[PDB]
Design a binder for this molecule. Structure first.
Ligand SMILES: OC[C@H]1O[C@@H](O[C@H]2[C@H](O)[C@H](O)[C@H](O)O[C@@H]2CO)[C@@H](O)[C@@H](O)[C@@H]1O
Ligand SMILES: [Cl-]
Length: 407
């Protein structure tokens, strides 16, 4: 009694996604961004496509490069992807990893000198996520050992064992800071959904390659925190910012984070094999996906950016909510069997192909305005790597493969 798109449609979508990943996204990253002056990868590519090898380089971006090429190598086997992941890994260990106090710096100069030495849990999480993926792709002992050490530092220096979750930012020597903001966009509050979502993401990937008992308890506690404090059943949206006791300190809505969390929360519970928790997580996951479907979409099926603190709808199409909606809508289809979610995934894919991707300049535009005009944003910067759209294509390819095997 399944309602399944026919084989032609599944295979056609899968082929377009694979072409987008390999002939646009990963081709752009492998050819435009490696830096032969300082090694590793440039920190910025302008809207004109010009790389900036002297620009400061962020840990999050470089972890995202590592994760994406590692995951693409694991799933597709292409030797160039292993080469690019190795390039990212070597620069990362040399320069971003703090050999003295542990963890990864926030920002380094192009030549690798530390520029911003704060230890932000969001950056520590992406390091764990990328290093665990690199271990998964290669079996590398050093990568896994490093991920484990950063996990230990997060728990040692940041875990709030009274109220749950984590202090989100420390200085280089792991002393907590007051200002945990990732950027000027973020509320000056002590707890954020965003950082906690990527702790969960990192811990789930680490657990898949290192199923330690205590880590299972920390991962389950994070899932439980999302269900009890962050997910809002009255609205189907994540609450974005909190005080230390998880009292809400924001009313903004991030559609991209909702639909990302929808599928990441289920990935995390399944990595645990926590069948007792799964019903409640699936319920919250499907709710987030439905709320996104009903409230976060333009008539073309693309995702709006946010509802701000004063209620303003930001109708800009940022690249990464579209990617996350591709995965989250396919995931909601797989979980519920409701083909309306597949139709939604197809619609966002068509938007990606017709508006978000930059066919002339390569990769994807960071932002497209509601009237269709691409903004002249950087193509690569501190916050724009290959991870959201690379992962979304990899996930879609594998999910469509599974669906194709129902026949
Ligand atoms: O507010 C911090 C920055 O967010 C960025 O988007 C992130 C997003 O917060 C989240 O972590 C997502 O899962 O990854 C995204 C892509 O970098 C950007 O909006 C940036 O401008 C913000 O400063
Ligand atoms: Cl990214």
């Amino acid at each position: 009694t399944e309602t399944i798109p026919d084989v032609r449609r599944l295979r056609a979508l899968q082929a377009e996604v694979h072409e987008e990943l390999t002939e646009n996204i990963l081709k752009f990253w492998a050819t435009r961004t490696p830096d032969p002056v300082h090694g590793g990868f440039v920190g910025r590519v302008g809207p004109d496509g010009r790389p900036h090898p002297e620009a400061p380089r962020g840990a999050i971006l470089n972890a995202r490069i590592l994760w994406t090429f590692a995951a693409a190598y694991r799933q597709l086997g292409t030797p160039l992807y292993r080469e690019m992941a190795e390039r990212a890994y070597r620069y990362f260990v040399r320069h971003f990893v703090d050999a003295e106090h542990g963890g990864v710096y926030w920002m380094v100069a192009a030549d690798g000198r530390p520029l911003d030495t704060r230890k932000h849990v969001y950056a520590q999480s992406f390091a764990i996520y990328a290093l665990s993926e690199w271990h998964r792709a290669t079996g590398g002992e050093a990568a896994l050992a490093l991920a484990r050490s950063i996990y230990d530092l997060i728990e040692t220096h940041c875990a709030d064992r009274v109220h749950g979750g984590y202090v989100e930012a420390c200085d280089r020597a792991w002393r907590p800071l007051e200002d945990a903001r990732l950027s000027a966009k973020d509320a000056p509050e002590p707890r954020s959904m965003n950082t906690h979502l990527h702790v969960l993401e990192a811990y789930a990937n680490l657990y898949r390659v290192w199923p330690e008992t205590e880590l299972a308890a920390r991962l389950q506690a994070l899932i439980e925190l999302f269900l009890r404090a962050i997910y809002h059943p009255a609205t189907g949206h994540l609450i974005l910012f909190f005080d230390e006791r998880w009292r809400p300190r924001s009313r903004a809505v991030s559609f991209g984070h909702d639909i990302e969390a929808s599928w990441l929360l289920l990935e995390a519970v399944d990595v645990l094999g926590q069948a007792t928790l799964r019903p409640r997580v699936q319920q919250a996951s499907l709710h987030l996906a439905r709320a996104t479907l009903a409230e976060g979409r333009a008539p073309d099926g693309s995702l709006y950016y946010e509802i701000g603190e004063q209620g303003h709808l930001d109708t800009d199409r940022h690249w990464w909510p579209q990617a996350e909606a591709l995965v989250g809508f396919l995931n909601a289809y797989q979980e519920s069997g409701e083909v309306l979610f597949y139709e939604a995934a197809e619609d966002v894919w068509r938007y990606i192909r017709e508006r978000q991707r930059d066919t002339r300049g390569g990769e994807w535009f960071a932002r497209v305005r509601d009237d269709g005009a691409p903004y002249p944003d950087d193509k690569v910067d501190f916050w724009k790597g290959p991870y959201h759209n690379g992962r979304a294509c990899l996930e879609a390819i594998q999910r469509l493969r599974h669906l194709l095997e129902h026949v």
